[PDB]
Design a protein around this ligand. Structure first.
Ligand SMILES: CC1=N[C@H](C(=O)O)CCN1
Ligand SMILES: [Mg+2]
Ligand SMILES: [Mg+2]
Ligand SMILES: [Mg+2]
Ligand SMILES: [Mg+2]
Length: 306
């Protein structure tokens, strides 16, 4: 059979590395093919829920509108800063590995893997060292309600836009900045039009890969196990890919542009942003109720454990 798989990124980007590794495993261990669509090549969540696509890689930044619990990743300062700790969290978290699949299943999706891509970095038309520096800045975010609340809490004017409108928007001043991992800032050339990078340490860009659940449940036991084993292979390959990637990506940006500036917030500057985090957490629970509180409690337990 041929299984269609869509993701949000371009050739060679972190989601594509995961996708090609998944494809490779399926094709090396079966007679099936995986047809991968990169960004723009086909909405993708709609097409997966209605069965046009078999697999989709969608980030909580977008899925959080449909699946409110996925907004948890946008509570700032909740996630750890360092790669090693984040990796252990994604490996061991009940919230990630048991609770989230149930929440996705409510929407007709078989959640196969969640994984990190890289630390979130702000880019803007000036260095952002305090919430006051965000005042009257239009900062583009992905399109979920809580992420807009995070940026409002930080002092910015969130301008939730889809990805396609971002480069041009920064170029012509529709927006004043954005947030993304360094590998994407590099690969998308965003540093050309948004040259001041600030490492706020507030979060990680994370993503999820899932199947249409009716499709998955219709597969033979053998093929279901093939998919699980492919997802595991892809996860391991991708985790190895992201090791050192942010550092390499930043060196590439510095090599390409003398106009780029890098601001790393110190502990005092970080605390000023962390002061804004609790009211975001309360909005998350007001958006998700007792079920959201249960997830958040487990997510926090899991972070304590690592
Ligand atoms: C890192 C990344 N950013 C996109 C965005 O900010 O819309 C979505 C796909 N991947
Ligand atoms: Mg100002
Ligand atoms: Mg204002
Ligand atoms: Mg150098
Ligand atoms: Mg040069």
């Amino acid at each position: 059979d041929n299984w269609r798989y869509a993701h949000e990124e371009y050739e060679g980007d972190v989601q594509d590395v995961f996708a090609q590794a998944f494809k490779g495993y399926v094709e090396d261990n079966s007679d099936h093919t995986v047809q991968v669509y990169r960004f723009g090549e086909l909405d993708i969540m709609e097409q997966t829920q209605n069965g046009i696509l078999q697999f989709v890689n969608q980030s909580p930044g977008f899925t959080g509108s449909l699946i409110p619990s996925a907004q948890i990743f946008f509570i700032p300062y909740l996630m750890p800063t360092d790669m090693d700790t984040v990796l252990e969290f994604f490996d061991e978290s009940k919230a990630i590995n048991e609770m989230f699949p149930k929440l996705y299943a409510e929407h007709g999706l078989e959640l196969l893997k969640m994984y990190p891509e890289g630390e979130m970095v702000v880019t803007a038309d000036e260095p952002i060292t305090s919430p006051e520096d965000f005042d009257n800045k239009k900062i583009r975010t992905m399109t979920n309600p809580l992420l807009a609340e995070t940026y409002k809490a930080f002092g910015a004017t969130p301008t939730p836009l889809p990805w396609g409108e971002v480069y041009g928007g920064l170029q012509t001043g529709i927006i004043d900045g954005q947030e993304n991992p360094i590998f994407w800032i590099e690969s998308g050339g965003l540093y050309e039009v948004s040259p001041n990078l600030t490492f706020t340490s507030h979060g990680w860009f994370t993503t999820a890969m899932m199947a249409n659940q009716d499709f998955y449940e219709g597969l033979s036991e053998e093929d279901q196990q093939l998919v699980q084993d492919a997802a595991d292979a892809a996860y391991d390959h991708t985790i190895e890919h992201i090791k050192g990637l942010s550092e390499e990506s930043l060196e590439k940006i510095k090599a390409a542009s003398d106009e780029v500036t890098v601001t790393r917030l110190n502990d005092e500057q970080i605390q000023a942003f962390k002061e804004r985090a609790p009211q975001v957490e309360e909005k998350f629970i007001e958006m998700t109720g007792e079920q959201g509180q249960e997830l958040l409690d487990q997510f926090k337990a899991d972070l304590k454990a690592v």
